[PDB]
Subunit: 329 residues, 4 copies
């Protein structure tokens, strides 16, 4: 046990193939430090009096929590000091953050410092989501640099603060899971080249929105409960934190859904720092991610805080739902 | 911050009122040690290779996981060395465990060493549930000592290994939450005299069993989705771990349900170490816990592993469901 | 590894022999909590900005450090809430602290909340020392209750914050070492019935006081450096923290000395909370502890802060020094 | 507290000045991981059963301890995976270790995986020492690459596992101290541009070697005990672990000595991984390090395990001893 395969070694030994400037490793290294700090505070939030609100409303509705601010500050700071980023997009910040010339790098990072706001106080799993882009312009860095389709992602993933803290990282060639060892403070590889099952047996959605669901979603759920071929009905799971439900979908298979509805044409989840990163992870794992009409990763954003419906998980499950939408179109 | 209000001080300063032998404090102290050990292993289960099965089937169906065995061993051992117990009942053990004469105490403890088996590998919140009884007999200790109705509980609660580890403890006069501070290894009081809201806005149940639900449950869910008075529909949440869903119900209010169905006359959850402890906590917090026809705490068990349907949470929500059952009776 | 032999179990399973009120276990339990808190802060004192002075001078000369105050507060508080003490004596407090009637127990505790003041800022090992007496009076508790000879100790020991944190505990039948496992926050038994070697090969004293040493000490040191029988000279060690040097003497054997000198008739170390506890530990381990003229444990104190010369360690080494004193008398 | 100034940021933001390949940061990053792992095991060595011998004798006399092997393995592995080293020299390895072509970097690292062997079992402070050189040759990497005078060091320091774990790092422009925060597993800057006092009041040496000391050392010690100008005698301190005694000398000032003697012409401490790193740190802090006749950093080694006498600390103290040697020459 004297040869620790940390996330840093893995990535460094990864980018070795395509010998680069090595700033991706600097970036992920910095992010890991922020995630460990968030994890430490979360595991003892009540003792630190970190539950409750901070007294503010972000770019859209959400009532800002104390952990939102703390985690947001930690991420912004480590990313800047990494000398690997130039444009930062955060759920908590109205406008994109342009990194000062002195600490600029070539990457653009979109992130949700803390996902699962509604589950903080009840101690349910929460997390951090991020998507990383390569600046594809010569002009001065600006918000436009973050308005790229998810297909242009070079790296994406999330930190899940669940029963254990896990950092799930996806890059061009695959998905790997690294678990944080609290004792030495290192993320250690525990799952290599993760692939999602072709078909699962769990569906995840907030059925409290039944009244607003479109005919397609309605039909699909009914089918999951009453299989036309007498097969066993799917089990239902909905933790309430996107990071938790998506991670379960990844390792157990099945489908996760936050579709558009009669009151929300574009669903709720944010495209830049919620939908695209998860869609990217899902596809590198052999899964699918759709709005119900088009691939999430192919949407070209016009607003860093725009929303997007999302249906992701096992290919056969997502495809089954797609056929329903096509049928009702 | 030099006056730590630990669970031990709290209880000790509690039992002071009714000056006893002090073995309840010894018992809870021992249990806290087991819970801290479980929490430590869980937060790093993958690194310790604790995911997966152990190769056995407990008293009923459940496929035994590695953490089931580890947690079960830890609990049995600390309880025995506490010199405060005489009869132990565990989900993992076919028959009751009689404590050797040398280490016998007056309490009977029923527990689920690790609840949320299906959510272990996906890193979703899991926990430990326990119920404590006072031996009300003169005969040699036996399994019969554990066959008491939940109303005879003198203490009950659970350890939740969620975003933070919390030990929720209920006794005759109330419910208190203690959070584990990983740094010093002490459970610290963070929530005093917890009370559940009279009415919530979240319903929690596995709707994958829609085909097997009785008319009452079916009507209630439909009502939560389509309120007859145009009020906002309830939100849906179902983590999949009883300890996680019940804790959210406690702090946020609402209702949790694992009713009987066409294939399970007595539901799934176990009365002794799952239903009664949660029912007890719920009632000391001002909530209700019913099978749909009778109070869970009033059932007189005949099998230490018998099952019982359970509906618990905010009084007004549970009562609303009860009226439906009565209506359909 | 599911049967943790903690200090609590050990003691509880110890006092079982002479079934008592069990408050000694409550007392040691409380003390363990304070020691874990001190250990946590010490391992990260610089990050917490706990180095430096607090701006005060205790009962005698010593310039009060920030950790002196923090550790003192923690110990006082846990001891009071233990319901096992009535009179407290601390190096940091001018007068004895009488516990309020409501939380009174039968034990008297003398302690040095933090020993090794001069080694704090250089990160050298430091610790906590304590001696416990049974109140042998009917009168209201007072300072006089702490003025008992060390031979009346019922328990004594120290917490060493060295490369690892160790709690060394001595009672009527022996000495045992318990190491703090930072991960679960429990002191675990690692050394049972510790006994010191009859003769060692290390001498420990501050030779910077050569000019003030009496003829006996001078002769002994010279003999350690130039053995009259051509044996190998003893090695010298002097960490500067009594707890560190005494612990090394215990496990490696040898001698530790802080004798009286031409400017300090009664040495420097305090009898109540430094000399007696270490003398007690030393004797229960088969060692000796003398002033050079009389056994430390036999001195009847008249001042809770009085000083006493001390020579302790392997019997043959201490006896050799005693013969020198007798020779020069 | 959301802007953590870690060792990594510091160094990275340091090497920024002289924009390099950045592999020094990779190297220090890797080393930090090994040091955290060693620190974790040390703080709980007894519980892990890591005390005792491994059953082997290194390059010279020393009886190999279990922690020697563990720490040695950890350091070798992290250094290799860093892609920043080509030649490794370890106290535990008879010959230099040549890094495989695939993972070669430009630095040569000499280190003592665990210093203070004799103080392990008594829980006294121990540590890790390292010195880093830049390969100044075109030939294939070999042992000769490590045979450079200490003046060619580009970085050196040590990890002290004392009351707190501290990583002291010296480079061309100065010395900085970083303390390990066990909670998040990051070394945090706590002391910037450290400078040693010009004159101290503590002398540190094993006086058990009085019989073998040369006239100069003998005279100096006598002078420290009996000041010719009636000034206060110096205090004596000798922990027994070079890393602990040197760190105290650095922060408190004074002198540390392990001179040659009648039986050891070149002292005991090893030049490559003990003397040079400490001499380098000492000089960057404004101190001195001599054999008594020549500067340690100017010695050109001929054996990777050769020994060297060493006298270091406050300039005025070291100079005073030098004048004595010159006087006796
Ligand atoms: O309560 P709702 O509408 O189901 O929203 C839950 C979703 O919202 C989020 O909290 C984002 O705000 C996701 O983490 C989660 O999937
Ligand atoms: O998958 P299902 O049938 O919803 O069962 C989930 C329930 O089973 C349990 O895992 C008990 O086995 C509970 O913790 C949880 O509430
Ligand atoms: O610096 P001196 O005089 O050797 O004193 C050291 C002694 O003083 C103490 O720090 C007590 O104040 C002991 O821990 C230690 O043994
Ligand atoms: O016991 P001695 O001869 O004083 O040796 C102590 C010295 O040896 C070392 O342990 C090296 O082996 C140093 O850490 C320490 O300074
Ligand atoms: Mg939000
Ligand atoms: Mg979110
Ligand atoms: Mg968020
Ligand atoms: Mg089970
Ligand atoms: Mg269960
Ligand atoms: Mg279970
Ligand atoms: Mg003092
Ligand atoms: Mg002291
Ligand atoms: Mg003190
Ligand atoms: Mg050695
Ligand atoms: Mg060494
Ligand atoms: Mg060594």
């Amino acid at each position: 046990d004297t040869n620790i395969v940390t996330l840093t070694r893995f990535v460094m030994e990864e980018g070795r193939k395509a010998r680069g400037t090595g700033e991706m490793t600097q970036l992920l290294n910095s992010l890991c430090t922020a995630v460990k700090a968030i994890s430490t505070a979360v595991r003892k939030a009540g003792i630190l009096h970190l539950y409750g609100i901070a007294g503010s409303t972000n770019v859209t509705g959400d009532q800002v929590k104390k952990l939102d601010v703390l985690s947001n500050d930690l991420v912004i700071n480590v990313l800047k000091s990494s000398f690997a980023t130039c444009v930062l997009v955060s759920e908590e910040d109205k406008n994109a953050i342009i990194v000062e010339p002195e600490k600029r790098g070539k990457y653009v990072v979109c992130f949700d410092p803390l996902d699962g706001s509604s589950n903080i106080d009840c101690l349910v799993s929460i997390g951090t989501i991020f998507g990383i882009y390569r600046k594809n312009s010569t002009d001065e860095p600006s918000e436009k640099d973050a308005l790229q389709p998810g297909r242009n992602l070079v790296a994406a993933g999330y930190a899940l603060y669940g029963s254990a803290t896990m950092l799930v990282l996806a890059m061009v060639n695959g998905v790997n899971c690294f678990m944080l060892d609290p004792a030495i403070g290192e993320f250690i590889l525990v799952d290599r080249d993760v692939k999602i099952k072709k078909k699962g047996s769990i569906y995840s959605i907030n059925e409290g929105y039944a009244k607003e669901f479109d005919p397609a979603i309605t039909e699909y759920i009914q089918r999951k409960k009453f299989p036309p071929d007498n097969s066993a009905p799917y089990g239902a799971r909905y933790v309430g934190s996107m990071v938790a439900d998506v991670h379960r979908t990844l390792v157990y298979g099945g489908i996760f859904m936050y579709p558009a509805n009669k009151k929300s044409p574009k669903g709720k989840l944010r495209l830049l720092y919620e939908c695209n990163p998860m869609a990217y992870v899902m596809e590198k794992a052999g899964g699918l991610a759709t709005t119900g009409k088009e691939a999430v990763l192919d949407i070209v954003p016009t607003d860093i805080h725009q929303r997007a419906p999302i249906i992701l998980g096992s290919p056969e499950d997502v495809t089954e739902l797609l056929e329903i939408y096509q049928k009702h179109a």
